[PDB]
């Protein structure tokens, strides 16, 4: 079983293993440029090794040092989203097994595809700049020369200056701080994580941040501004923690802190280890966002612990995640709760799988990356059909109890190992030898390799839907003089989830007479609402519906903030709608420099300009 990382240009872990990083770096706000060393120990698989590659992206070098002295070294053309392999020659040939550290001198550019830079006045206080950066998948090269490959996992250990007015934090353990020798004027954070992770789980923001503590294991870090909503918001952190502990087993990070970052942060959650970094689109005010949370502390077994070999197998990280996510909020809100989320689920990935077109590579559980840049297959596929086959195999095996006691093995399992589908596959059949009858009963190629939706769809409880469904279809099915009927007292009893889940599906059959939509303003005042999903959905509807009046609002939620869930959709609507077509585009050419680089990548795509 020989499988290579097509999404990366550096060496293979059958050639050599990055076993730890020691990154010294300054972060230079007047250049926007990270620069410093990288000092990889690495590990040699083979005998007599050379040379070795690694990854690297609009990376400037300015010297290979081993052995105290410096050593010839060659950038290889640029492949696109790939970056530029280098290819650095050794001093002298290393025999298996053999460790040596290579110390490269660097600098980012100014574009790295894994940072973004701000202004002070892109932030909450309007006086200090920050930096954040976001990894995940194949950014991490854009930062630093490294195997960029989840089927390598390292430790690591940095110093970075920083100017002395701001804070530096990382994916790690903080390690203690003290003024520049070099620089009174900059201060340096050092770290440590002594747990091996994969690269794309590296990562750093500086900024005027401040903590508030709201766990026995767990700090918030926000700007000022933004702290006390954030404690509120987040809670129940703790809890979700020791319900996740329940279900993989113990949590080996040590601490467990959560970061806002400005509204430009792309995800709506990344599971950095020791800090997971959150959007602030998440401050609804009631924690009714808080399955996000659920979702990235799930993480800290399921894609952090046991790790996706190389992207094609993402449903591992996500489809397991998300499943665990839904025990998390089953346990803390009701199994028909679990069933709730797990229903709106399906629909995402009919809209997914509608988007992308049924026969769509893309579509694929397991997809080919070999020449995609995974940015652009992203998808909630892996999320949904990866979650789907989980409860399908839950319901087939016995129930969740029985199925949590795999998962709860399967982690146990692979821990700090990256694996594949077949490993996974191989696992299941092992755990549940005395059922394997059952498992032959699972189409197996339709399920991991086929696109379009699942050649089976799981059993749901309905019990929460059946509200949402039946208001939706009132309005579909409703004429002119049916409007009158309609009042604020049709949402007296749905929850938020069930608000979001009925503009889900009346966004389904969009567009609705323009008519219909001013009285769904006229009486339910969605207007009003500040739930940033919910805001999202009754846009898009609005959008998709002609109304005029929703432009300016939707142009103003697609800019003010970045998370791309949201941003994409928005633009694409707007620039389907003939109204505001000029106007979107306009808007986008004015704030694209200002925007997150791979969101504006990926917007500009989607609006077919540049
Ligand atoms: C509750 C979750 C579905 C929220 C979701 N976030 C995630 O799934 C994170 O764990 C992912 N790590 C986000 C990600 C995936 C691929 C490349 C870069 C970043 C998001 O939408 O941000
Ligand atoms: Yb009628
Ligand atoms: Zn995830």
């Known amino acids: 079983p020989e499988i290579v990382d097509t999404c990366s240009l550096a060496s293979p872990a059958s050639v050599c293993r990055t076993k730890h ?219 979700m923690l020791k319900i996740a502990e329940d279900l993989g087993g113990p949590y080996v990070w040590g601490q467990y802190d959560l970061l806002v970052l400005p509204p430009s942060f792309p995800y709506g959650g990344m599971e950095n280890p020791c800090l997971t970094f959150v959007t602030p689109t998440l401050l609804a005010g009631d924690k009714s966002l808080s399955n996000v949370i659920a979702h990235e502390i799930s993480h800290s077994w399921t894609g952090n612990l046991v790790t996706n070999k190389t992207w094609d197998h993402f449903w591992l990280n996500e489809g397991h995640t998300v499943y665990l996510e839904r025990h998390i909020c089953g346990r803390l809100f009701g199994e028909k709760f679990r069933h709730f989320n797990a229903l709106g689920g399906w629909g995402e990935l009919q809209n997914s799988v509608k988007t992308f077109g049924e026969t769509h590579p893309f579509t694929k559980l397991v997809v080919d990356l070999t020449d995609i840049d995974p940015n652009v297959a992203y998808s909630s596929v892996p999320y949904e059909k990866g979650f789907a086959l989980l409860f399908y195999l839950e319901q087939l095996l016995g129930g969740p109890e029985i199925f949590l006691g795999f998962l709860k093995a399967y982690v146990e399992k692979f821990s700090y190992k990256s694996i594949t589908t077949d490993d996974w596959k191989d696992f299941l059949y092992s755990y549940f030898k005395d059922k394997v009858d059952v498992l032959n009963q699972v189409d197996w190629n339709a399920w991991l390799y086929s696109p379009g939706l699942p050649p089976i769809k799981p059993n749901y409880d309905m019990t929460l839907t059946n509200a949402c469904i039946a208001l939706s279809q009132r309005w579909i099915t409703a004429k002119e003089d049916d409007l009158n009927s309609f009042n604020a007292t ?61 432009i300016p609002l939707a142009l103003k939620m697609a800019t003010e903030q970045g998370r791309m869930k949201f941003t994409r959709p928005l633009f694409k609507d707007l620039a389907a709608f003939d109204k505001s077509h000029d106007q979107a585009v306009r808007t986008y050419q004015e704030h694209k420099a200002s925007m997150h680089p791979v969101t504006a990548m990926l917007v500009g795509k989607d609006l077919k300009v540049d």
């Open 21 to 239: 990083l020691h990154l010294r770096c300054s972060v230079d706000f007047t250049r926007r440029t990270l620069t410093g060393t990288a000092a990889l120990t690495v590990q040699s698989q083979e005998d007599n090794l050379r040379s070795l590659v690694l990854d690297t992206k609009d990376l400037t070098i300015e010297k290979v040092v081993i052995n105290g002295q410096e050593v010839k070294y060659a950038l290889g053309e640029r492949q696109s989203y790939k970056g530029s392999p280098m290819e650095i020659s050794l001093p002298i040939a290393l025999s298996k097994n053999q460790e040596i550290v290579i110390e490269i001198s660097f600098e980012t550019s100014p574009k790295s595809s894994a940072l973004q830079w701000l202004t002070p006045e892109q932030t909450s206080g309007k006086e200090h700049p920050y930096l954040f950066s976001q990894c995940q998948a194949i950014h991490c090269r854009a930062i630093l020369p490294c195997q960029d490959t989840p089927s390598v996992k390292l430790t690591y250990t940095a110093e970075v200056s920083v100017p002395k007015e701001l804070v530096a934090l990382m994916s790690a353990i903080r390690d203690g701080e003290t003024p520049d020798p070099e620089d009174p004027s900059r201060k340096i954070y050092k770290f440590i994580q002594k747990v091996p992770i994969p690269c794309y789980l590296i990562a750093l923001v500086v900024g005027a941040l401040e903590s508030r503590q709201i766990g026995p294991r767990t700090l918030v870090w926000s700007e000022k501004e933004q702290v006390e909503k954030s404690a509120y918001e987040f809670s129940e952190t703790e809890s």
């Open 490 to 550: 049709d949402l007296k009893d749905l929850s938020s989830h069930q608000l979001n889940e009925f503009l889900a599906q009346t966004l389904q059959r969009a567009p609705l007479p323009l008519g219909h939509i001013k009285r769904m303003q006229e009486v339910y005042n969605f207007n009003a609402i500040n739930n940033s999903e919910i805001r999202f959905r009754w846009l898009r509807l609005c959008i998709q519906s002609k109304w005029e009046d929703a």
